[PDB]
């Protein structure tokens, strides 16, 4: 039997989990078996493989290939003052400012910022669009303010 994580069924690991009543977080070989709704669509492999990808957990970290924490605020295009390497971002932040006039920079922007790049291949691979990332972030994070480039 395999030893690598997620399938740690080596030796006595699984028998102790049952007999010692270890909680959910202590399980090293946890599994589930999900049955596709409806029986006729359950017979198709192509429909099976895509739903499996949809239910899998995709977090931010795997969509990013580099991120940077910067000590800078934003007061629109009136004050500037940015990191030198990333000072070129205002070329699209100005595009973002006019393309998304509904959510202007708030009146309480702190002097901090995280700039993140996306691994487009992973986005292409697992079909997360830039629209879905931004919408989910803003709904989950309401003390942060969002700028993004254009994915096309």
């Amino acid at each position: 039997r395999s030893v690598a994580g997620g399938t740690n069924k080596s030796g006595i690991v699984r028998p102790q989990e049952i007999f010692s009543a270890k909680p959910v977080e202590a399980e090293q070989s946890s599994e589930m078996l999900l049955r596709l709704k409806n029986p006729e669509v359950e017979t198709n492999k192509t429909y099976a493989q895509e739903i499996a990808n949809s239910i899998e957990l995709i977090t931010f970290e795997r969509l990013i290939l580099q991120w940077h924490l910067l000590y800078e605020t934003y007061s629109s295009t009136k004050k500037n003052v940015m990191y030198p390497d990333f000072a070129s971002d205002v070329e699209w932040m100005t595009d973002f400012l006019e393309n998304h006039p509904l959510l202007q920079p708030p009146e309480d922007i702190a002097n901090w910022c995280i700039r993140l790049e996306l691994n487009k291949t992973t986005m292409i691979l697992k079909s997360i669009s830039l629209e879905s990332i931004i919408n989910s972030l803003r709904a989950k994070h309401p003390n942060t303010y969002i700028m993004h480039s254009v994915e096309n």
Binding site: I64, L65, H68, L69, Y83, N111
Partner: protein
């Protein structure tokens, strides 16, 4: 990394208030402009296959225990090359004692 010009000591960062101002235990301050604003960073799948194996790749054609293959070297036309496999990506590199490096690595 900021070192005190007089004490040669490491200076705290002390982000107050709209700028970055380094401070030493001797009370000296030097402040910071522009290029000091990078607080922290992390780049994924970087720092691998360039800095970890540079010495090993350089010495590989001279290692007796490295596996070798029958393949012509473009530079010195030696009939054998040194075959190298690095990483969980299994990147195959062919290197020669003449410095030929297959442009990979």
């Amino acid at each position: 990394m900021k070192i005190c010009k007089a004490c040669s000591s490491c200076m705290v960062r002390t982000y107050v208030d709209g700028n970055i101002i380094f401070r030493c235990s001797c009370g000296e301050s030097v402040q910071g402009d522009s290029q000091n604003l990078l607080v922290s960073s992390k780049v994924y799948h970087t720092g691998e296959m360039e800095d970890k194996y540079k010495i090993f790749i350089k010495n590989a054609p001279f290692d007796p225990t490295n596996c070798q293959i029958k393949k012509d070297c473009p530079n010195c036309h030696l009939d054998y090359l040194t075959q190298i496999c690095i990483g969980s990506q299994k990147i195959i590199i062919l290197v020669c004692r003449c410095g030929y490096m297959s442009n990979r690595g």
